[PDB]
Amino acid sequence: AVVKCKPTSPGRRHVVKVVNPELHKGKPFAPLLEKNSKSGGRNNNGRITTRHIGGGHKQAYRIVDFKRNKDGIPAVVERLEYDPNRSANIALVLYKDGERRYILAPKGLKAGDQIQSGVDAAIKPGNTLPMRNIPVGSTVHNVEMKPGKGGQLARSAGTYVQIVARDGAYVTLRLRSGEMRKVEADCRATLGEVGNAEHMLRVLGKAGAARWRGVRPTVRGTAMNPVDHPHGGGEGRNFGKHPVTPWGVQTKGKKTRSNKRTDKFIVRRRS
Amino acid sequence: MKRTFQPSVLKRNRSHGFRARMATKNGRQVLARRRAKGRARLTVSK
RNA sequence: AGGACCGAACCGACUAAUGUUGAAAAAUUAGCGGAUGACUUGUGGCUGGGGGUGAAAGGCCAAUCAAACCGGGAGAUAGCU
RNA sequence: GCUCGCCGGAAGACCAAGGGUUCCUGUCCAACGUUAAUCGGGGCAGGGUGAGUCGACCCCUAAGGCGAGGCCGAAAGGCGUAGUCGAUGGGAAACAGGUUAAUAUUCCUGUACUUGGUGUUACUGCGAAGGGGGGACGGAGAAGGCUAUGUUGGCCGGGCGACGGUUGUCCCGGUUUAAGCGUGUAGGCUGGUUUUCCAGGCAAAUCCGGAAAAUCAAGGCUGAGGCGUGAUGACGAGGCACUACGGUGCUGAAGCAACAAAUGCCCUGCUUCCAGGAAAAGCCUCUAAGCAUCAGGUAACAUCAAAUCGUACCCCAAACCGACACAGGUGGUCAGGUAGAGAAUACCAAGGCGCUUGAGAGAACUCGGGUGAAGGAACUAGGCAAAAUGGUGCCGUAACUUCGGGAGAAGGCACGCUGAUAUGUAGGUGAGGUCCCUCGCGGAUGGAGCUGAAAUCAGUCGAAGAUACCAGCUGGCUGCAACUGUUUAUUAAAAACACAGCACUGUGCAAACACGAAAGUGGACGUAUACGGUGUGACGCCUGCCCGGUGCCGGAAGGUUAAUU
RNA sequence: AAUUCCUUGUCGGGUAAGUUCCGACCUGCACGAAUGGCGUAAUGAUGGCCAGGCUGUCUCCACCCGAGACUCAGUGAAAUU
């Protein structure tokens, strides 16, 4: 749960952390590991395209079944392992046929529950089945926009999506950002919500905690010099412009979505 | 104090060697220019 | 346990004196700060100039930088000495 | 040659990188060496570097490079699949002693080990560009056994002291040995065996995984260290003979025990924490096609083979980087004694040095220091500088407070040596015997020896007992920044930047954005609890009012309005 | 106030004597609310002020110890003109 650390040191005064006792301790399943090198924000041209990225603790990638197409065979969850790659915990399932896989951890799941995937699977938190079958009005997660493409939306910890209507071959969902979006009705999804919901309440406390995760410091525009950034320099503290990006695009209000191809699927833009 | 030239034969060969120069056509142009000028040593080597 | 304390190696340069034709084209001497970390170091690799990088001083990019070095336009032009 | 002084977690020894004969011998002082120079890293001549086990080479691979085909681009070309390269990482094996002026895990002696080939022999399921296993991996913390090593006591060989004593609880020296081989210990890890099935591991599998039974309560894996062997060997203080006076030839006793103990080993171990900690090959196993007497595999024996390149010298400096024989810089390895917490510090050991101009004299003045009557900041922009405090144990310690702190606040007390407590106590260490058995590197007892803080009391010396070195000035009011941190290499380290936190804002994934004439790449193998941009910058109380101006957002069919017609 | 020209504003504290310091008045030339307002424990090689100890900073310098400066032998520059 959420725990505060007492102020023994200034770098420790404001530290608040979430500790889960149930998470398994020990090395993860080796056959599901693979190397993952960090880039530092530089593309194949060796040029920095994204800023504030670099350093951080070394990490290894873990293979997660975002498709869940292995239907007809039940499985038992063994443990809830910790994933440094993402924000949500990952459960290690074993199918009745001895095949081991990793999945996102739904809320309310403990070691021992049954799991089933398929068109005829039972309605319970975690089961996977296309919206041809889910009753209208429920909460799911790990949804996809194209069949067989794998889970694509609402994958961060603590999030979900709410289904509101099925019209013919298209259903309508209310995304976490508030958008009302159409989607093809033969896409599969997982019922329930993603676990580790209290991920919000952590407080980093000190800059070293952020740096452990590989994020470089950000330099304010208003203190810069004129030659590099439009917000420019000047004596004292002078701003006297309208806020703008480093490349000259005005911020604080300007829309940027210009994809006329997929505008047919949006029913209501977020408000 | 620590100053500019810190010798390293491997770096020297890989940055100014015969093969490194000739890998691209600019290096070929440099080699041709040195040959025309008639320099004693075309590039750094043993 | 601690971006916890005192303090060697290690890193840095706050004060004073000398030196400034210097043992040195930025030292030395006596003090000084950090010293399990946002730490420091070896080797190799990548980022090329109106560009790179920059916890951001117009700082660094081979003793140089409000636009590097070499070669060329080029015997630029000079109502000035 | 004798004496003196200095360094000695170095100014000692060995490498890496880098340099290339600077290494040794003979020979000369033309030029170089900040003076002489018979000397030299100088000049000339000659000599010197020996590898199946050490590195390179070689098998594999990360960051990354190149890249058939391919995509894209006026041309030149950019990116990338198959693939190939690329260590700073993974992969087999030699020890001790002796010799040159210059080489030595390379030459010699003795004792080893690894890999591959060939043949003989006996048995015989062999087979991969495929599947499994393993290789194969974070930080911090703790403590039991060890070892290096040192000290002491014995042992052996010497000695009786230039000046008071100095046959003994006196002084000096030594009291050493590897790899491999067997032993499998302290200790760590894991139940084992058999049978029967199975939508999985691209097919296949007896292999892995999963399921169901029966059976046993030990059974494997790992493992420092110790003992034996190696080793009747070598070495060995010395002594003996020549000293072509450098060295050479012989010979050569004792060669034990206790205690202490590493940052090294067990330990790639154990506990614990979140920031969740390379890859591939060698090695073991499964089968696919194929081959079956074969072929091939297995085990023993004998035999052959293990190519090439580097091996001199300096390597915290006179040889490297700095125009210099330059007070500067340069990664790793080993780490004695005394006191001490210490790799600090002062004096020494092994070892290495006195820094390539000297000799006189004792003006002003300058530089680095020592002391100083009385005053004690009166100096000055400013206590700049200098002066001053400084250790261990114990007692005692305010306001404020985010209850953590402040705080080592402040402040005070004891500190040497000798005797006794106690002929060396507490404590630690621990054999011989005794018994039992698992007869083993076994178990209980048992205390010999060995080592040994701290404290009390009594006495005693000095002016001075934390005597040297080493080793915080303290308090009060107050502006700024919450704090650790970063910055103008080379006049500015800060009230500047950053930071955790807060707010707005854009982005529904082929995301926004950014580098690219383009393919493409980052974002991100992430999916609104996420990502980008801007503003402020812990925490607490808060964050009035104004939409006229300028921007941004939502609508215009009212007006004006382009290419076209 | 790191604001404030007039201004060394006025009063109080501190000193024998205080344009600096602290606490108030308010007539804010020309503060003010996320280019943030007010306060804040702890922290700072940070700015300002005041005490005790300490002393050659000073009153006012005196003596001594070493390296130069002087002499002799040897080698043997430079700026400028």
Numbering used by the authors:
A (entry chain BD): 2 to 272
B (entry chain BN): 1 to 46
Text of the article:
Transcription and translation are central gene expression processes subjected to extensive regulation. In bacteria, the absence of a nuclear-cytoplasmic barrier means that ribosomes can translate RNAs as they emerge from RNAPs in a process known as coupling. Significantly, we find that the ribosome increases the speed of transcription at the expense of decreased fidelity by exerting mechanical force on the RNAP and by allosterically inducing an active anti-swiveled conformation of the enzyme. Our work shows that the coupling of translation to transcription prevents prolonged stalling of RNAP at the expense of transcription fidelity through a combination of force and allostery in vitro.
Initially, the consensus TTC reconstruction revealed an ill-defined density for RNAP, indicative of a heterogeneous orientation relative to the well-defined ribosomal density, suggesting that the ribosome might have translated to different positions on the RNA. After discarding the set of TTC particles with the RNAP distant from the ribosome via multi-body refinement, we were left with a sizable population of particles (around 20%), from which we obtained a TTC reconstruction with highly reduced variability in the position of the RNAP. In this TTC, the 70S ribosome and RNAP regions were individually focus-refined to 3.8 Å and 7.3 Å overall resolutions (FSC = 0.143), respectively. Finally, the maps were combined, resulting in the full TTC. The geometry of the RNAP in this map represents the most probable state, which occupies a ‘central’ position on top of the ribosome 30S subunit. In this structure, the RNAP β-flap, αI-NTD and β′-zinc binding domain (β′-ZBD) are located close to the ribosomal proteins uS3, uS10, and uS4, respectively. We observed clear density for RNA along the entry channel of the ribosome, lined by uS3, uS4, and uS5 ribosomal proteins. In this present TTC structure, the position and interactions of the RNAP with the ribosome resembles the ‘expressomes’ or ‘collided TTCs’ previously described.
